[PDB]
Amino acid sequence: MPPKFDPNEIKVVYLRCTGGEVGATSALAPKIGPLGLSPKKVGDDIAKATGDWKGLRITVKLTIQNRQAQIEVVPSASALIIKALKEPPRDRKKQKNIKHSGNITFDEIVNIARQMRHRSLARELSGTIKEILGTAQSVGCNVDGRHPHDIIDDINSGAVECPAS
């Protein structure tokens, strides 16, 4: 219900330099550098904007939008400053224990054993469970449960009943 407006990508840069000189200022270096803006355009805009030979303790501010810089000159100095305190969202990066495959559980062995699929059926239930689980321990030092004795003990005890799980 409430009204709203779409935001625009506007950047504000503070420039403290007087005289005829072209180039990028201190803020422009770290901003324009990664932005990919052309410093020549900014320097030319600054020189043309301040081509009146302004030099008396004055602060110049410029607005950057779509590689277009607008030069605004205000009298005196001590310009206001504000920080958004917000940054654009991005995807984080982290390590995973998946590696080759991971997620090895006796349930999987039981599932193929009951399904009779050629994945971990092998021959004997105990032989295949121990073999696959043993392989899991070799590939992962901490896959989930590196206890073959307990696994076969639990499997033999009655890990699977009517359903495969």
CATH number reported for the structural domain that contains residue 52 in this entry: 3.30.1550.10
Find out whether 130 and 152 touch, Cβ atoms under 8 Å: yes
Query: What approach was used to elucidate this structure?
Result: NMR
Do 119 and 110 meet the contact criterion of CB atoms below 8 Å apart? no
DSSP state of 73: E
Closest CA to 104 of 128, 68, 74, 71: 128
> b/e per residue, 89-98, with b = 16+ CB within 10 A?
eeeeeeeeee
- Whole-angstrom distance, CA of residue 122 vs CA of residue 120: 6
Longest distance between any two alpha carbons in the chain, whole Å: 93
Domain residues for the domain of 31 are 11-74
What's the order of all strands across the beta sheet hosting 68-74? Answer: 11-15, 59-65, 68-74
**In Å, what is the CA distance from 161 to each residue of 31, 66, 105, 111, 157?**
65, 67, 17, 12, 10
DSSP 20-37: S--S--TTHHHHHHHHT-
Q: Distance between CA 88 and CA 155 in Å, rounded?
A: 51
Look up residue 135 and give its amino acid: T
